[PDB]
mmCIF file of C-alpha atoms in Angstrom:
data_model
loop_
_atom_site.group_PDB
_atom_site.id
_atom_site.type_symbol
_atom_site.label_atom_id
_atom_site.label_comp_id
_atom_site.label_asym_id
_atom_site.label_seq_id
_atom_site.Cartn_x
_atom_site.Cartn_y
_atom_site.Cartn_z
ATOM 1 C CA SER A 1 114.133 174.627 154.052
ATOM 2 C CA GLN A 2 114.640 173.748 157.650
ATOM 3 C CA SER A 3 111.862 171.651 159.546
ATOM 4 C CA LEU A 4 110.681 172.602 163.081
ATOM 5 C CA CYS A 5 108.645 169.904 164.598
ATOM 6 C CA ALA A 6 109.279 169.549 168.277
ATOM 7 C CA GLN A 7 107.020 171.707 170.560
ATOM 8 C CA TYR A 8 109.668 174.678 171.174
ATOM 9 C CA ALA A 9 111.934 174.205 167.866
ATOM 10 C CA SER A 10 113.015 177.328 166.690
ATOM 11 C CA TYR A 11 114.972 179.103 163.945
ATOM 12 C CA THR A 12 117.247 182.015 164.861
ATOM 13 C CA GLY A 13 117.990 184.163 161.502
ATOM 14 C CA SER A 14 120.244 187.178 161.661
ATOM 15 C CA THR A 15 116.842 189.128 161.638
ATOM 16 C CA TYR A 16 114.125 186.957 161.655
ATOM 17 C CA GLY A 17 113.103 183.935 163.852
ATOM 18 C CA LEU A 18 110.823 180.956 163.257
ATOM 19 C CA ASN A 19 108.962 179.266 166.017
ATOM 20 C CA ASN A 20 106.992 175.936 166.197
ATOM 21 C CA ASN A 21 105.676 177.192 169.391
ATOM 22 C CA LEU A 22 103.121 174.380 170.292
ATOM 23 C CA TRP A 23 102.673 176.151 173.683
ATOM 24 C CA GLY A 24 99.134 174.538 174.417
ATOM 25 C CA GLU A 25 99.810 170.796 173.056
ATOM 26 C CA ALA A 26 99.113 169.400 176.196
ATOM 27 C CA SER A 27 95.326 170.895 175.456
ATOM 28 C CA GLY A 28 94.691 168.503 172.967
ATOM 29 C CA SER A 29 95.664 165.832 170.249
ATOM 30 C CA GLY A 30 97.686 166.293 167.143
ATOM 31 C CA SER A 31 100.474 167.424 165.413
ATOM 32 C CA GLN A 32 102.142 170.550 163.913
ATOM 33 C CA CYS A 33 105.391 171.346 162.281
ATOM 34 C CA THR A 34 106.762 174.560 160.953
ATOM 35 C CA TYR A 35 108.949 174.949 157.730
ATOM 36 C CA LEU A 36 111.586 177.787 156.978
ATOM 37 C CA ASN A 37 111.646 178.075 153.418
ATOM 38 C CA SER A 38 114.222 181.274 153.550
ATOM 39 C CA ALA A 39 114.993 183.858 155.751
ATOM 40 C CA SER A 40 117.068 186.857 155.047
ATOM 41 C CA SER A 41 117.680 190.561 156.192
ATOM 42 C CA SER A 42 114.772 191.702 154.090
ATOM 43 C CA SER A 43 111.978 188.933 155.228
ATOM 44 C CA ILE A 44 111.199 185.614 155.949
ATOM 45 C CA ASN A 45 109.185 183.004 153.901
ATOM 46 C CA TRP A 46 107.694 179.912 155.882
ATOM 47 C CA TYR A 47 104.803 177.813 156.459
ATOM 48 C CA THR A 48 103.143 175.625 159.234
ATOM 49 C CA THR A 49 100.864 172.441 158.969
ATOM 50 C CA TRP A 50 98.826 171.363 161.722
ATOM 51 C CA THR A 51 95.771 169.188 162.808
ATOM 52 C CA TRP A 52 94.598 169.820 166.233
ATOM 53 C CA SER A 53 91.567 168.353 167.928
ATOM 54 C CA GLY A 54 90.024 168.459 171.472
ATOM 55 C CA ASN A 55 89.156 171.388 173.925
ATOM 56 C CA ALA A 56 87.759 173.551 171.328
ATOM 57 C CA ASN A 57 88.140 176.693 173.275
ATOM 58 C CA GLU A 58 92.039 176.544 174.034
ATOM 59 C CA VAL A 59 94.564 177.780 171.661
ATOM 60 C CA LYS A 60 97.088 174.754 170.891
ATOM 61 C CA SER A 61 99.989 176.833 169.798
ATOM 62 C CA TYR A 62 101.197 179.858 168.090
ATOM 63 C CA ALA A 63 103.620 178.986 165.478
ATOM 64 C CA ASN A 64 105.104 182.447 164.337
ATOM 65 C CA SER A 65 107.780 184.336 162.509
ATOM 66 C CA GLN A 66 109.590 186.952 164.734
ATOM 67 C CA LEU A 67 111.379 189.998 164.320
ATOM 68 C CA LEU A 68 114.633 189.670 166.263
ATOM 69 C CA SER A 69 116.701 192.476 165.016
ATOM 70 C CA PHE A 70 115.245 195.590 166.509
ATOM 71 C CA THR A 71 115.869 198.089 169.720
ATOM 72 C CA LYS A 72 113.362 197.966 172.342
ATOM 73 C CA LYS A 73 112.250 201.451 172.566
ATOM 74 C CA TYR A 74 109.268 203.378 174.013
ATOM 75 C CA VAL A 75 106.279 203.268 171.756
ATOM 76 C CA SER A 76 106.081 207.140 171.647
ATOM 77 C CA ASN A 77 109.935 206.975 170.504
ATOM 78 C CA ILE A 78 108.968 204.681 167.346
ATOM 79 C CA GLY A 79 108.532 206.676 164.333
ATOM 80 C CA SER A 80 107.314 203.625 162.101
ATOM 81 C CA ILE A 81 106.892 199.775 162.125
ATOM 82 C CA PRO A 82 106.238 198.885 158.469
ATOM 83 C CA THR A 83 105.256 195.423 157.926
ATOM 84 C CA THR A 84 104.094 193.188 155.105
ATOM 85 C CA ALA A 85 102.391 189.688 155.485
ATOM 86 C CA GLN A 86 101.488 187.752 152.121
ATOM 87 C CA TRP A 87 99.826 184.452 153.192
ATOM 88 C CA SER A 88 97.188 181.874 152.385
ATOM 89 C CA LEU A 89 95.536 179.159 154.295
ATOM 90 C CA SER A 90 94.729 175.784 152.451
ATOM 91 C CA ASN A 91 92.030 174.705 154.205
ATOM 92 C CA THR A 92 89.537 177.555 155.890
ATOM 93 C CA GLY A 93 87.497 174.651 157.804
ATOM 94 C CA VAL A 94 89.354 175.099 160.959
ATOM 95 C CA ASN A 95 89.085 177.448 164.127
ATOM 96 C CA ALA A 96 91.982 179.692 164.137
ATOM 97 C CA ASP A 97 93.328 183.407 163.599
ATOM 98 C CA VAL A 98 96.149 184.732 161.726
ATOM 99 C CA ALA A 99 97.544 187.004 163.783
ATOM 100 C CA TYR A 100 100.377 189.783 164.457
ATOM 101 C CA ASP A 101 101.119 189.630 168.383
ATOM 102 C CA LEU A 102 103.094 192.555 169.899
ATOM 103 C CA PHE A 103 103.622 193.135 173.606
ATOM 104 C CA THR A 104 104.833 195.977 175.501
ATOM 105 C CA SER A 105 106.062 196.529 179.125
ATOM 106 C CA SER A 106 107.194 199.438 181.313
ATOM 107 C CA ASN A 107 109.886 196.795 182.359
ATOM 108 C CA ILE A 108 112.519 196.553 179.280
ATOM 109 C CA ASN A 109 113.703 193.243 180.707
ATOM 110 C CA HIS A 110 110.000 191.670 180.728
ATOM 111 C CA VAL A 111 109.738 188.161 179.497
ATOM 112 C CA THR A 112 108.922 188.876 175.528
ATOM 113 C CA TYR A 113 105.823 186.448 175.487
ATOM 114 C CA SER A 114 103.760 188.810 177.460
ATOM 115 C CA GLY A 115 103.538 192.413 178.650
ATOM 116 C CA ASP A 116 101.547 195.090 180.508
ATOM 117 C CA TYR A 117 99.853 195.500 177.184
ATOM 118 C CA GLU A 118 99.359 193.282 173.973
ATOM 119 C CA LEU A 119 98.357 194.334 170.683
ATOM 120 C CA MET A 120 96.928 191.489 168.169
ATOM 121 C CA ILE A 121 96.106 192.382 164.605
ATOM 122 C CA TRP A 122 94.173 189.419 163.240
ATOM 123 C CA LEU A 123 94.482 189.560 159.237
ATOM 124 C CA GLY A 124 92.394 186.247 159.194
ATOM 125 C CA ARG A 125 89.727 184.768 161.374
ATOM 126 C CA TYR A 126 88.147 181.273 160.759
ATOM 127 C CA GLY A 127 85.529 179.770 163.161
ATOM 128 C CA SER A 128 83.607 181.506 165.181
ATOM 129 C CA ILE A 129 86.547 182.507 167.587
ATOM 130 C CA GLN A 130 86.789 185.928 169.191
ATOM 131 C CA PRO A 131 89.694 188.082 170.990
ATOM 132 C CA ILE A 132 90.124 188.546 174.395
ATOM 133 C CA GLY A 133 87.640 190.991 175.897
ATOM 134 C CA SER A 134 84.714 192.490 174.044
ATOM 135 C CA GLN A 135 84.676 194.722 171.021
ATOM 136 C CA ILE A 136 84.774 198.251 172.080
ATOM 137 C CA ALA A 137 84.925 200.485 169.009
ATOM 138 C CA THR A 138 85.618 200.219 165.083
ATOM 139 C CA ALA A 139 88.621 201.811 163.573
ATOM 140 C CA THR A 140 90.159 202.625 159.790
ATOM 141 C CA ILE A 141 93.383 202.057 159.841
ATOM 142 C CA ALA A 142 95.874 200.875 156.924
ATOM 143 C CA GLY A 143 93.134 201.198 154.377
ATOM 144 C CA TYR A 144 90.915 198.510 156.381
ATOM 145 C CA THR A 145 88.066 198.613 158.881
ATOM 146 C CA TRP A 146 88.832 196.563 162.050
ATOM 147 C CA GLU A 147 86.731 195.636 165.049
ATOM 148 C CA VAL A 148 88.524 196.864 167.988
ATOM 149 C CA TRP A 149 88.718 194.601 171.021
ATOM 150 C CA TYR A 150 89.886 195.034 174.410
ATOM 151 C CA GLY A 151 90.135 193.186 177.597
ATOM 152 C CA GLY A 152 92.378 191.532 179.911
ATOM 153 C CA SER A 153 93.345 192.400 183.570
ATOM 154 C CA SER A 154 95.538 194.332 185.360
ATOM 155 C CA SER A 155 98.822 192.354 184.722
ATOM 156 C CA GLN A 156 97.985 192.600 180.603
ATOM 157 C CA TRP A 157 95.785 194.531 178.669
ATOM 158 C CA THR A 158 95.243 193.273 175.106
ATOM 159 C CA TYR A 159 94.068 195.101 172.111
ATOM 160 C CA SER A 160 93.015 193.018 169.237
ATOM 161 C CA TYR A 161 92.312 194.745 165.784
ATOM 162 C CA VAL A 162 90.221 192.226 163.775
ATOM 163 C CA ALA A 163 89.622 191.927 160.090
ATOM 164 C CA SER A 164 86.232 190.830 158.890
ATOM 165 C CA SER A 165 87.307 188.876 155.739
ATOM 166 C CA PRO A 166 90.775 187.689 155.407
ATOM 167 C CA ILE A 167 93.580 190.127 154.353
ATOM 168 C CA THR A 168 95.953 187.580 152.661
ATOM 169 C CA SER A 169 97.911 190.530 151.240
ATOM 170 C CA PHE A 170 98.765 193.041 153.897
ATOM 171 C CA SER A 171 101.059 195.989 154.124
ATOM 172 C CA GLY A 172 100.923 198.696 156.799
ATOM 173 C CA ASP A 173 102.405 200.526 159.506
ATOM 174 C CA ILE A 174 101.815 198.984 162.986
ATOM 175 C CA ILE A 175 102.794 202.248 164.780
ATOM 176 C CA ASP A 176 99.151 203.457 163.387
ATOM 177 C CA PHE A 177 97.512 200.850 165.282
ATOM 178 C CA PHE A 178 99.575 202.126 168.388
ATOM 179 C CA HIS A 179 98.629 205.740 167.558
ATOM 180 C CA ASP A 180 94.927 204.517 167.575
ATOM 181 C CA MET A 181 95.446 202.999 170.940
ATOM 182 C CA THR A 182 97.026 206.177 172.005
ATOM 183 C CA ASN A 183 94.929 208.688 170.705
ATOM 184 C CA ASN A 184 91.695 207.070 171.242
ATOM 185 C CA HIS A 185 92.250 204.680 174.296
ATOM 186 C CA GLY A 186 94.968 206.278 176.320
ATOM 187 C CA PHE A 187 97.650 203.553 175.646
ATOM 188 C CA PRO A 188 100.727 205.223 177.501
ATOM 189 C CA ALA A 189 103.070 205.049 174.679
ATOM 190 C CA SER A 190 105.834 207.227 176.346
ATOM 191 C CA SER A 191 105.964 204.561 179.235
ATOM 192 C CA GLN A 192 106.058 201.259 177.449
ATOM 193 C CA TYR A 193 108.885 199.734 175.680
ATOM 194 C CA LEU A 194 108.010 197.540 172.529
ATOM 195 C CA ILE A 195 109.330 194.300 173.476
ATOM 196 C CA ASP A 196 108.317 191.789 171.127
ATOM 197 C CA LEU A 197 106.641 191.602 167.301
ATOM 198 C CA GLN A 198 105.659 188.370 165.968
ATOM 199 C CA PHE A 199 103.204 186.908 163.177
ATOM 200 C CA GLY A 200 101.466 183.602 162.997
ATOM 201 C CA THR A 201 98.511 181.557 163.729
ATOM 202 C CA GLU A 202 96.548 180.404 166.670
ATOM 203 C CA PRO A 203 95.107 177.063 166.046
ATOM 204 C CA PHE A 204 92.070 175.654 168.370
ATOM 205 C CA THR A 205 90.641 172.736 166.064
ATOM 206 C CA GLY A 206 90.580 171.311 162.732
ATOM 207 C CA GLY A 207 92.993 170.433 160.164
ATOM 208 C CA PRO A 208 95.239 169.114 158.471
ATOM 209 C CA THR A 209 95.666 172.811 157.194
ATOM 210 C CA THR A 210 98.436 174.835 156.029
ATOM 211 C CA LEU A 211 99.462 178.273 156.559
ATOM 212 C CA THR A 212 101.880 179.388 153.869
ATOM 213 C CA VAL A 213 103.564 182.711 154.716
ATOM 214 C CA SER A 214 105.242 183.223 151.397
ATOM 215 C CA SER A 215 106.611 186.766 152.447
ATOM 216 C CA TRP A 216 106.685 188.473 156.249
ATOM 217 C CA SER A 217 108.658 191.242 156.954
ATOM 218 C CA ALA A 218 108.729 194.100 159.814
ATOM 219 C CA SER A 219 111.244 196.482 161.191
ATOM 220 C CA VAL A 220 111.168 199.087 163.977
ATOM 221 C CA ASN A 221 112.337 202.509 162.876
ATOM 222 C CA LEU A 222 113.402 205.504 165.046
ATOM 223 C CA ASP A 223 112.512 208.858 163.814
#
């Protein structure tokens, strides 16, 4: 039932971590704590409460649960990345996304907070915020239709798959998004290690609001 309120307060479980991760706090005024409900080998259940004001265009944080227990492999060598997210947001009158964040790198010892590539999956978008880059496609994946956004620079390309209306109860295989990137956008799966897998929320402004993640899970399975 632990409380993570400091800027970088974290919990390290056997399989999952939880991070308050107020990385952009200097960008505005407010407050945010993240709370472990429970963590097991099967899943993690948590919530985060926040109020942020100022610099409407700057992300203030990315509180997240994180899969700690997986081997870094080339994306081409990953058979499946099954994941589930069951969540709700108590106050929708905010500017925020609710999103998976993944990074890949050719360098297996790359910092895990960025990469050569970034894949985000926005399960929920509140307020007229948009991913990095521009929308370049639409795709049907995991039984839903996504706007496919792409942008960044040479040092990091970000693919964002964006749900129109919130998917508060999600199950899918993240590898299908990688496949989409590989088959349709030339993503170099066989020379990029999956180095990070998180789920959480990027607040811009609004609140108080609470994101409750009653259940989150992921694993990275080899063939």
